[PDB]
Design a protein around this ligand. Structure first.
Ligand SMILES: [Mg+2]
Ligand SMILES: [Mg+2]
Ligand SMILES: [Mg+2]
Ligand SMILES: [Mg+2]
Ligand SMILES: [Mg+2]
Ligand SMILES: [Mg+2]
Ligand SMILES: [Mg+2]
Ligand SMILES: [Mg+2]
Ligand SMILES: [Mg+2]
Length: 231
RNA sequence: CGUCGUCAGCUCGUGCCGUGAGGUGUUGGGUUAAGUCCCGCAACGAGCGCAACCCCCGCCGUUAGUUGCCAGCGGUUCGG
């Protein structure tokens, strides 16, 4: 799968502001930052991709979570390529532990989708119209990827567990396995299937997520070639 | 029924934090007469209040013209 292409796009990130528990995946400090051991990256990648393939074979769903400014686009296209749920803008506290209450809002979202169509009604007062259109804009902004979730997922794919500790907490509490891309400032104990790679550069996230979703696509009988690559 | 006080408030469901009383939401920034609205946020929503729905005044239109009124017309003891 990977075959040494990792070095061209990334090796690691982050200086002395590190988590010492990450030391099992670090090789050296050269410019002041930590260089991730790429052989350990490959060894972990084999296990992670094997688990991902086994899960995708059985029909389970993976929730792709990423909200940094370097992943608002990669995550969306990668998760949409598999027809898979994603969170892209902001993790709403309780998106998993309060799944029923939060998913009550997508019912309102879909109800407002069938409200603004031309056939039925346009006789609402204009101020109420603007209220409902504000509500629709917010619901679409925050629940556009969450809509594909009909139940609690079988795994969550997180691009930065330190930044997204609330999602990891919710997943670990509910016994849902968590897969994470993590740099040297991360806690690996909370991550079941780790990939020790750089998660702040665009190309590293692109490569990892794109190839992961290629494996998912393969695990359902098909080969879709092109992915959105953005230099 | 008076009063704080027509003051801008008081709470709830589920989730989360805390051994617990409890907290969060409801804090921060801008705005409003207003917990009014916007942005941000472990919260996501909701209820009672605010506002609106009702009445009077201010402009115009349709239906009508008596016991109302009298622009134009003709009478007139001079009051339609
Ligand atoms: Mg918890
Ligand atoms: Mg008071
Ligand atoms: Mg509560
Ligand atoms: Mg406790
Ligand atoms: Mg209060
Ligand atoms: Mg409070
Ligand atoms: Mg008031
Ligand atoms: Mg209010
Ligand atoms: Mg009122």
């Amino acid at each position: 799968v990977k075959e040494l292409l990792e070095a061209g796009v990334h090796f690691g990130h982050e200086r002395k502001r590190w988590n010492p528990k990450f030391a099992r995946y670090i090789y050296a400090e050269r410019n002041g930052i930590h260089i991730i051991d790429l052989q350990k990256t490959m060894e972990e990648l084999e296990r992670t991709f094997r688990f991902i393939e086994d899960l995708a074979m059985r029909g389970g769903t993976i929730l792709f979570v990423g909200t940094k400014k370097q992943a608002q686009d990669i995550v969306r296209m990668e998760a949409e390529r598999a027809g898979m749920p994603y969170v892209n803008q902001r993790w709403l506290g309780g998106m998993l532990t309060n799944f029923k209450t939060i998913s009550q809002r997508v019912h309102r979202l879909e109800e407002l989708e069938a409200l603004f169509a031309s056939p039925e009604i346009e006789e609402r007062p204009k101020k109420e119209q603007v209220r409902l259109k504000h509500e629709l804009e917010r619901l679409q902004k925050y629940l556009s990827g969450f809509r594909l979730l009909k139940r609690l997922p079988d795994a969550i794919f997180v691009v930065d567990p330190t930044k997204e500790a609330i999602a990891v907490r919710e997943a670990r509490k509910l016994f849902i396995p968590v897969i994470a891309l993590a740099d040297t400032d991360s806690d690996p104990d909370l991550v079941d299937y780790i990939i020790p790679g750089n998660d702040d550069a665009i190309r590293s996230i692109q490569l990892i997520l794109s190839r992961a979703v290629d494996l998912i696509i393969q695990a359902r009988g098909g080969v879709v070639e092109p992915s959105p690559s953005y230099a």
